[PDB]
Motif scaffolding. Structure first.
Motif, PDB file in Angstrom:
ATOM      1  N   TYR C 701       0.832  -1.203   0.000  1.00 28.16           N
ATOM      2  CA  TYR C 701       0.000   0.000   0.000  1.00 28.16           C
ATOM      3  C   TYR C 701       0.867   1.254   0.000  1.00 28.16           C
ATOM      4  O   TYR C 701       0.686   2.134  -0.838  1.00 28.16           O
ATOM      5  CB  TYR C 701      -0.949  -0.014   1.204  1.00 28.16           C
ATOM      6  CG  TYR C 701      -1.670   1.285   1.492  1.00 28.16           C
ATOM      7  CD1 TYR C 701      -2.364   1.944   0.493  1.00 28.16           C
ATOM      8  CD2 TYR C 701      -1.687   1.835   2.775  1.00 28.16           C
ATOM      9  CE1 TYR C 701      -3.034   3.121   0.745  1.00 28.16           C
ATOM     10  CE2 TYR C 701      -2.362   3.014   3.042  1.00 28.16           C
ATOM     11  CZ  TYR C 701      -3.038   3.659   2.021  1.00 28.16           C
ATOM     12  OH  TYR C 701      -3.724   4.830   2.274  1.00 28.16           O
ATOM     13  N   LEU C 704       3.050   2.051  -3.144  1.00 25.39           N
ATOM     14  CA  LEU C 704       2.290   2.777  -4.155  1.00 25.39           C
ATOM     15  C   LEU C 704       2.149   4.235  -3.749  1.00 25.39           C
ATOM     16  O   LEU C 704       2.372   5.117  -4.568  1.00 25.39           O
ATOM     17  CB  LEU C 704       0.910   2.147  -4.366  1.00 25.39           C
ATOM     18  CG  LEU C 704       0.921   0.680  -4.801  1.00 25.39           C
ATOM     19  CD1 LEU C 704      -0.460   0.066  -4.687  1.00 25.39           C
ATOM     20  CD2 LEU C 704       1.464   0.527  -6.209  1.00 25.39           C
ATOM     21  N   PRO C 722      -1.193  -5.085  -2.349  1.00 24.82           N
ATOM     22  CA  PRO C 722      -1.557  -3.803  -1.773  1.00 24.82           C
ATOM     23  C   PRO C 722      -3.057  -3.626  -1.629  1.00 24.82           C
ATOM     24  O   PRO C 722      -3.821  -4.234  -2.372  1.00 24.82           O
ATOM     25  CB  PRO C 722      -1.042  -2.817  -2.812  1.00 24.82           C
ATOM     26  CG  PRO C 722      -1.267  -3.527  -4.097  1.00 24.82           C
ATOM     27  CD  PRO C 722      -0.976  -4.973  -3.803  1.00 24.82           C
ATOM     28  N   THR C 724      -5.594  -1.091  -2.544  1.00 28.19           N
ATOM     29  CA  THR C 724      -5.735   0.041  -3.440  1.00 28.19           C
ATOM     30  C   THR C 724      -7.005   0.854  -3.223  1.00 28.19           C
ATOM     31  O   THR C 724      -7.178   1.897  -3.855  1.00 28.19           O
ATOM     32  CB  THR C 724      -5.762  -0.437  -4.893  1.00 28.19           C
ATOM     33  OG1 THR C 724      -6.969  -1.180  -5.115  1.00 28.19           O
ATOM     34  CG2 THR C 724      -4.529  -1.304  -5.202  1.00 28.19           C
ATOM     35  N   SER C 752      -7.012   5.862  -0.905  1.00 33.97           N
ATOM     36  CA  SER C 752      -7.233   4.843  -1.929  1.00 33.97           C
ATOM     37  C   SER C 752      -6.473   5.188  -3.200  1.00 33.97           C
ATOM     38  O   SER C 752      -6.865   6.099  -3.918  1.00 33.97           O
ATOM     39  CB  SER C 752      -8.730   4.744  -2.226  1.00 33.97           C
ATOM     40  OG  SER C 752      -9.443   4.326  -1.068  1.00 33.97           O
ATOM     41  N   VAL C 753      -5.399   4.452  -3.489  1.00 34.64           N
ATOM     42  CA  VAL C 753      -4.577   4.746  -4.672  1.00 34.64           C
ATOM     43  C   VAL C 753      -5.262   4.440  -6.003  1.00 34.64           C
ATOM     44  O   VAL C 753      -4.810   4.927  -7.031  1.00 34.64           O
ATOM     45  CB  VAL C 753      -3.189   4.050  -4.667  1.00 34.64           C
ATOM     46  CG1 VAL C 753      -2.417   4.391  -3.402  1.00 34.64           C
ATOM     47  CG2 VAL C 753      -3.298   2.545  -4.861  1.00 34.64           C
ATOM     48  N   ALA C 754      -6.319   3.630  -5.996  1.00 34.24           N
ATOM     49  CA  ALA C 754      -7.084   3.351  -7.220  1.00 34.24           C
ATOM     50  C   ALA C 754      -7.927   4.548  -7.685  1.00 34.24           C
ATOM     51  O   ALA C 754      -8.190   4.690  -8.881  1.00 34.24           O
ATOM     52  CB  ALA C 754      -7.964   2.126  -7.034  1.00 34.24           C
ATOM     53  N   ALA C 757      -5.336   7.236  -9.912  1.00 41.28           N
ATOM     54  CA  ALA C 757      -4.518   6.532 -10.905  1.00 41.28           C
ATOM     55  C   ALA C 757      -3.724   7.471 -11.810  1.00 41.28           C
ATOM     56  O   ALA C 757      -2.612   7.145 -12.209  1.00 41.28           O
ATOM     57  CB  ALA C 757      -5.390   5.613 -11.748  1.00 41.28           C
ATOM     58  N   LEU C 769       3.576  -4.512  -9.659  1.00 41.43           N
ATOM     59  CA  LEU C 769       2.551  -5.077  -8.786  1.00 41.43           C
ATOM     60  C   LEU C 769       2.751  -6.585  -8.645  1.00 41.43           C
ATOM     61  O   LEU C 769       3.047  -7.275  -9.622  1.00 41.43           O
ATOM     62  CB  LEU C 769       1.158  -4.775  -9.342  1.00 41.43           C
ATOM     63  CG  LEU C 769       0.741  -3.301  -9.266  1.00 41.43           C
ATOM     64  CD1 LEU C 769      -0.413  -2.999 -10.209  1.00 41.43           C
ATOM     65  CD2 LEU C 769       0.369  -2.917  -7.841  1.00 41.43           C
ATOM     66  N   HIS C 782      -8.489  -5.529  -5.734  1.00 38.92           N
ATOM     67  CA  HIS C 782      -7.675  -4.350  -5.414  1.00 38.92           C
ATOM     68  C   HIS C 782      -6.691  -4.076  -6.541  1.00 38.92           C
ATOM     69  O   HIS C 782      -6.622  -2.961  -7.054  1.00 38.92           O
ATOM     70  CB  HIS C 782      -6.906  -4.538  -4.103  1.00 38.92           C
ATOM     71  CG  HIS C 782      -7.750  -4.399  -2.873  1.00 38.92           C
ATOM     72  ND1 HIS C 782      -8.180  -5.485  -2.143  1.00 38.92           N
ATOM     73  CD2 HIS C 782      -8.233  -3.307  -2.240  1.00 38.92           C
ATOM     74  CE1 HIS C 782      -8.896  -5.069  -1.115  1.00 38.92           C
ATOM     75  NE2 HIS C 782      -8.941  -3.750  -1.150  1.00 38.92           N
ATOM     76  N   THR C 783      -5.949  -5.107  -6.932  1.00 42.19           N
ATOM     77  CA  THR C 783      -5.047  -5.010  -8.070  1.00 42.19           C
ATOM     78  C   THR C 783      -5.824  -4.859  -9.390  1.00 42.19           C
ATOM     79  O   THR C 783      -5.509  -3.980 -10.184  1.00 42.19           O
ATOM     80  CB  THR C 783      -4.070  -6.206  -8.112  1.00 42.19           C
ATOM     81  OG1 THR C 783      -3.198  -6.122  -6.983  1.00 42.19           O
ATOM     82  CG2 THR C 783      -3.225  -6.211  -9.399  1.00 42.19           C
ATOM     83  N   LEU C 786      -7.334  -1.403  -9.676  1.00 40.72           N
ATOM     84  CA  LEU C 786      -6.229  -0.455  -9.856  1.00 40.72           C
ATOM     85  C   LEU C 786      -5.729  -0.467 -11.299  1.00 40.72           C
ATOM     86  O   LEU C 786      -5.549   0.583 -11.897  1.00 40.72           O
ATOM     87  CB  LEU C 786      -5.071  -0.767  -8.899  1.00 40.72           C
ATOM     88  CG  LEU C 786      -3.758  -0.001  -9.108  1.00 40.72           C
ATOM     89  CD1 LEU C 786      -3.986   1.502  -9.026  1.00 40.72           C
ATOM     90  CD2 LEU C 786      -2.700  -0.442  -8.104  1.00 40.72           C
TER      91      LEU C 786
END
Ligand code: NA
Ligand code: NA
Lengths: 839, 10, 839, 10
Positions: C701, C704, C722, C724, C752-754, C757, C769, C782-783, C786
């Motif tokens: 997490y 990223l 991770p 995301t 939340s990295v998703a 983007a 990843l 999650h992946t 993302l």
């Protein structure tokens, strides 16, 4: 010879370059007119002979019409103006049917038309609509308004069809059952109660009027019911409409789970997927007898079943490939394959074979004995083959002149090894088998004697009967129009020949162009969609006429342009078609994109794009500037691009196609390497030290087989949605080409790259896998199980997933990302100067 | 059939 | 300063190097002895005082014993010999519990022991077994034979427990219901009929005696039933055994689908996963009253429920965190959190609160009114906090001397902000609320007055109560042993203090080592598993004794070695612990692996390994040569390796841990960059132009978040499994740290990295990843989600999947592949000379 | 909890 190294651009620059090159095709990628139909005006005073209706893109895909003049000014070129027929105004089952039919379009995919009334019927989104034109009602001079067929049904209605006997009635499928609906009286009745929409898939596996997965994906049949074309009259002054329909039971078929597109939910959908070796669905014919009163009200609906079971009457049959009715409506016909797909049967089925459904075993036995013993299935034609039966859409039945004879044209490869037309007459004998005796019928008790079998065409070339290719039969002049490969295997052309005293196969289309042709039902006109390597697609109308001295001889004349060619787009340099004598004996054709600004003394890296699978030809004299535009883009960056139609590809006859029977994977790369080496001996600029290979689906399968078998030749491999394991792929396809797993243990083993993971290279940046995460056809498992064995074998891979995608790229951002990653991978691991240093 | 489809254009 | 470039090895060579370095740890990775228990011999003539039993690896993990001499020769070091207690002879629910408990071992995970009889009870594979030693039956001098508890039950039996009141009886869970079984009479009875094994998950969502997913994953409770420790006697000369148990109903909990490990099948399993914001399971207490006759035959089983609903009696409660019985058996206790996890309650529950289940509404009303109004829930302790309640295993209850008072020790952070022991006495009042009045009870009607609340420990340091850390209470000398961080935050030590007149916290363990300690129940011995950065783990027995002048003062003496250290392995160069003053005010500790053969004038690339999540400390004075061996391997290849315990990590008190409440992702990378820059100013060899970051789970997490927030600092990021997108992760964890999504819209968005983007770099070979395809904890979604947004944002990625793996690496080939790919990625995109040219 | 586990050794 010094090595050429491609311009090492960054990711952001390559994205720019790809955007600007694509931006010069806004005007392009507007699909050509299709689904043509001709209608006579019958106006002796009026200036037009015909009106044509067709589907085209103006945005959405809609119905247009154009006028056909009685005479033309032969000085100038008439461009027909397109008149909008309609006025200006996806579910899961639509999304899947669009994958099954390979439809990229938006709007109206198809339409019915009742000739006698003018009634158009078509689906458009969720709505089923109708309009009228060209019947007794006359011809509109302005856009008509689509009339929605209203409904009580909650869910999407699929597969609408007008009743040919009565254009007030239609039929559609809703929640896997057959309904009917009157478009005047608004009456709406359910005809089958086979599926319960509220239940799960695991309990309720039955459907009616629908083609199951394998039939849609592997036999191109997308419907499971067929209106009888004539209505029997009753003493009331009413009538009896009939509908033949296929009923399936997928209870014994295996259940896979595919990820749902709503990734948020983290769930998965059930699919019935008959994987190879396992059970196909359990099929049977049924019939729905609909009594209509004087004014169009349903009196009663009787659902009828076969007098004996399907498995007893049609012994050996696994797939109902095609079905319909004879024009008279006296018999229902069907084309039936066995599991191995090495035995075809055309079988007539009388409506008297069907008896009403009864739960009561007393009542049922009275109905069975009341049906005569003479009424029986009639196998009017049968053929076998060592290789396989290729199903096609050619089957024409003539009006029944004599009582106990049926006359018909059919196409087949089982005699010569090339698909040819044959007029056949069969004698409809009373069968030897009798139902009163209380036994099962022996294998050949339903066969009919072949009274005549005149071959209409012949030679080392094939008639086309797939993807719209069919035949028009002029029953007045006793001719048959058809498409073929006679002049060349790289060009489709329209031909004509007599079906009574056959001989002279007369070509109607002009050489130097491949053609796709639709002939008018009146046989006095045809339309050709044509192109070649240089010139984009064009659509023209040609008038057919005979010389006065000989009606059998047919000549053509340009009448008008329906779609004009945009012309050669300056970016696109076409490829050069080459050929070579392979050591197998067959001549194999190819396409070469030479690098742009080819400098002497320098040798260039070589991407070999590949498919090399059955039912497909990549190398021919058609315009490749639309679909294979990025092969030219690679050539612009300084990559040699090769494409070779190896043994197994179509349009070269059955023996050529049958070359990999039981042996898929093993023969194809030899042909590709052979053709690739022929070129490098002939051309100084082909660097054989830096060769990439790339393909999708079967092309992805072979991209892996290349890297596995021939790591010496191929530096990199980009495998898109590959089959890694044949026990996963479905029955209809894989048993046709590879047989049952038990009876080809080694072929399956050697055909499956996941079983041979240790044979991949132990050097990274050579294997790139690409796969749609939602793929229902080539399940992601193929990739995931391949990766599982690569990890255990200690081998490296590169992977790109497309999470919004099935066995297709539809979201535009996915395709932009793909092309970008492809160029960047080729640059970083094959083409560029840094790619040389990496080793 | 093992035939991919490219009908997502811009 | 010139840049150092690492030796560019090939894939096959790196595999060789990784194999040979791993090959010198065949002797190592044999886990230390654990689950110790002491038993008195009571033999005045015999040479041994105690016998100890423990689990250890000889291969499989089994029961051993060793003898404790009455006297030792203090000249030499006694090595205790290990005697095998047993003689030499996975399902889905075992596979999942091994993920929930984080068990890497094979064999016996745990065991029960009834003191009075000698009865061991333990699971081993599918079998539940028993043996006897140290009771009246005496002490064996040779391996005993495990005695299988036979069964009629078809499926795996989980969670066996001896009845403390009667060692003939056991209880286990089978198909989510509680059974009992007598190991003498072989009688076997089902106590709960809540689950139907034959039904689907979607219809049958109830279970009994089981901890649901969130309790196992987030509260470390793996059992849902508790034997009453005393048996009530009947007039017959029989008895009444009792079992408190939790009953769940997961009907309203959402259903995700995880891919099945049998990839061949291409199916997916349903899991009940309470994602954040959605419904947790619906819990309640129940009780099973078992009447046994004179000789051990079940007369009857009465199933009893709470007199009023759970939601009325325990208003506000979402999670039963912990539960059990008082030693007398008079009350059943429970520790209860609310949804927000900011309010703890310790609540006693009398068996008289439970009444028999009755379908008949007439009969039910007679039983309700027959129970007295004075019988009521008793909240004996309550605490709130701004930050969160950390659940622990410390809760000791004293024998009840006075009638209406209860005396107990408990640990808490809610007063000072550091976890400390507190002796508490509560007065068990008759409640103000009365059931006859027919109203609902007001918020604080069940609260008990706190008569006394003496703090036993205090200061800027915490008592440990997780992962085996607990307290032993000597009720004779009136002391309490406990583990803490008082001498240092980098070292756990064993302490002792009086619980009556508290003051002097006396340390028992030796400095320069971190310790993990188990104290004998008799408090005259303790075992310490200890290590430091240099020296591997050791296990030693120490004898506890008092000086004659002062029993309160406790000193220790080395008695014997249970496990000897293998010694410093020549490959492993340990890291140097550093620290620095962050601009937040807190001191942050770190670990530095300098490159081996450090040459002056050269600057080296820098991998920063990271976790930086709650409930974990990576930097401390423990041996890291086993678990973090490959950080040394990176240092051997010429990479600087840094690890920093940022704010949020544990063992620094609640304020330090609460630093990222509502703000996960946002603060952690500042601390890491700060500590990383402090080092580069202090050391010439740290190249800041070539920094990698790598972590798993929360570390993934943050890997990223690093690349997203700080692309200037971090060249590459390797993110393993991770998170995301926080709306996907479960309630118990994510609401504790981030609250409900509605009441922290921005924290969730920024966490939340998703959702972000487009902020990733547009330069390839920077984002890698890694994810287990079968991950049930951090779902693959999650992946996949993302990647979905990265494709639409036009951003590049690299991906590696492990298809045989969940939120762990267990298959050895997966871990070998991972280390190989990691080194090769670091080499090709950070370390090597070619990595420099790529930009 | 977001805690990965490495207990697959050779
Ligand atoms: Na198809
Ligand atoms: Na846990």
């Amino acid at each position: 010879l010094e090595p050429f190294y491609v311009e090492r651009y960054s990711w952001s620059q390559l994205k720019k370059l790809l955007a600007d090159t694509r931006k010069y095709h806004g005007y392009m990628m507007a699909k050509a007119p299709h689904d043509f139909m001709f209608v006579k005006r019958n106006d002796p005073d009026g200036p037009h002979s015909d009106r044509i209706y067709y589907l085209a893109m103006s945005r959405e895909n809609t119905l247009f019409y154009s006028e056909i003049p009685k005479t033309i000014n032969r000085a100038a070129v008439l461009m027909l103006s397109w008149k909008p027929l309609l006025d200006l105004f996806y579910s899961r089952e639509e999304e899947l049917l669009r994958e099954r039919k390979r439809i990229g379009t938006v709007g109206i995919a198809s339409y019915d038309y009742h000739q006698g009334s003018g009634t158009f019927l078509f689906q458009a989104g969720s709505g089923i609509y109708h309009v009228k034109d060209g019947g007794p009602q006359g011809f509109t001079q302005q856009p008509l308004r689509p009339n929605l067929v209203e409904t009580s049904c909650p869910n999407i209605r699929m597969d609408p069809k007008l009743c040919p006997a009565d254009p007030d009635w239609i039929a559609f499928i809703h929640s896997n059952d057959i309904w009917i609906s009157n478009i005047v009286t608004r009456e709406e009745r359910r005809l089958t109660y086979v599926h319960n929409e509220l239940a799960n898939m695991e309990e309720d596996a039955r459907s009616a009027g629908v083609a199951t997965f394998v039939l849609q994906e592997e036999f191109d049949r997308y419907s499971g019911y067929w209106w009888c074309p004539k209505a029997e009259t009753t003493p009331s002054g009413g009538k009896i409409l009939r509908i033949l329909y296929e009923e399936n039971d997928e209870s014994e078929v295996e259940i896979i789970h595919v990820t749902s597109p709503m990734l948020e939910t983290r769930r998965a959908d059930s699919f019935r997927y008959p994987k190879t070796g396992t059970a196909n669905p359990k099929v049977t014919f049924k019939m729905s007898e609909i009594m209509i009163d004087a004014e169009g009200r349903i009196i009663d609906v009787i659902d009828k079943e076969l007098i004996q079971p399907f498995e007893i009457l049609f012994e050996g049959v696994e797939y109902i490939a095609r079905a319909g009715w004879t024009p008279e409506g006296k018999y229902a016909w069907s084309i039936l394959l066995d599991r191995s797909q090495t035995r075809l049967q055309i079988v007539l089925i009388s409506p008297e074979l069907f008896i009403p459904v009864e739960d009561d075993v007393m009542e049922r036995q009275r109905l069975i004995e009341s049906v005569p013993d003479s009424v029986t299935p009639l196998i009017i034609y049968e053929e076998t083959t060592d290789i396989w039966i290729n199903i096609h859409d050619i089957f024409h039945v003539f009006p029944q002149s004599h009582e106990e004879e049926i006359e018909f044209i059919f196409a087949s490869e089982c005699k010569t090894g090339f698909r040819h037309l044959y007029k056949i007459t069969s004698i409809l004998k009373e069968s030897k088998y009798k139902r009163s005796s209380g036994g099962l019928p022996a294998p050949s008790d339903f066969k009919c004697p072949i009274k005549e079998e005149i071959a209409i065409t012949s030679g080392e070339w094939e008639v086309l009967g797939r993807h719209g290719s069919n035949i028009q039969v002029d029953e007045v002049r006793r001719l048959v129009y058809f498409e073929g490969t006679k002049d060349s295997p790289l060009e489709h052309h329209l031909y004509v020949v007599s079906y009574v005293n056959p001989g002279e196969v007369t070509r109607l289309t002009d050489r130097g162009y491949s053609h796709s042709c639709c002939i008018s039902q009146h046989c006095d006109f045809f339309i050709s969609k044509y192109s070649n390597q240089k010139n984009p697609h064009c659509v023209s109308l040609y008038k057919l006429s005979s010389p006065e001295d000989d009606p059998t001889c047919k000549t053509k004349e340009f009448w008008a342009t329906i779609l004009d060619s945009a012309g050669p787009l300056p970016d696109y340099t076409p490829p050069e078609i080459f050929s070579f004598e392979s050591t197998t004996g067959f001549t194999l054709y190819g396409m070469l994109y030479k690098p742009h600004d080819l400098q002497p003394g320098k040798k260039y890296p070589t991407v070999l794009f590949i498919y090399g699978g059955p039912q497909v030809q990549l190398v021919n004299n058609r315009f490749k500037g639309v679909k294979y535009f990025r092969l030219n883009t690679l050539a612009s960056l300084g990559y040699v691009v090769v494409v070779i139609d190896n043994r197994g590809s179509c349009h070269r006859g059955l023996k050529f196609e049958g070359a990999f029977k039981y042996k898929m994977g093993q023969i194809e790369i030899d042909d590709q390497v052979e053709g690739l080496q022929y070129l490098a001996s002939r051309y100084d600029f082909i660097d054989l030290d830096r060769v990439g290979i790339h393909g999708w689906s079967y092309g992805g399968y072979l991209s892996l087989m290349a890297l596995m078998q021939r790591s010496d030749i191929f530096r990199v491999a980009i495998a898109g949605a590959p089959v890694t394991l044949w026990i996963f792929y479905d029955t209809g396809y894989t048993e046709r080409y590879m047989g049952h797993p038990d009876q080809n243990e080694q072929g399956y083993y050697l055909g499956s790259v996941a079983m041979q993971a240790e044979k991949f290279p132990s050097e990274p940046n050579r294997l790139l896998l690409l796969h749609g995460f939602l793929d229902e056809n080539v399940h992601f498992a193929h990739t995931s199980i391949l990766l599982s064995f690569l990890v255990r074998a200690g081998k490296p891979y590169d992977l790109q997933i497309y999470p919004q995608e099935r066995h297709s790229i539809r979201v535009p951002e996915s395709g932009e990302h793909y092309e970008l990653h492809l160029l960047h991978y080729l640059q970083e691991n094959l083409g560029s100067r840094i790619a040389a240093l990496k080793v | 059939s093992l035939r991919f489809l490219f009908e997502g254009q811009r």
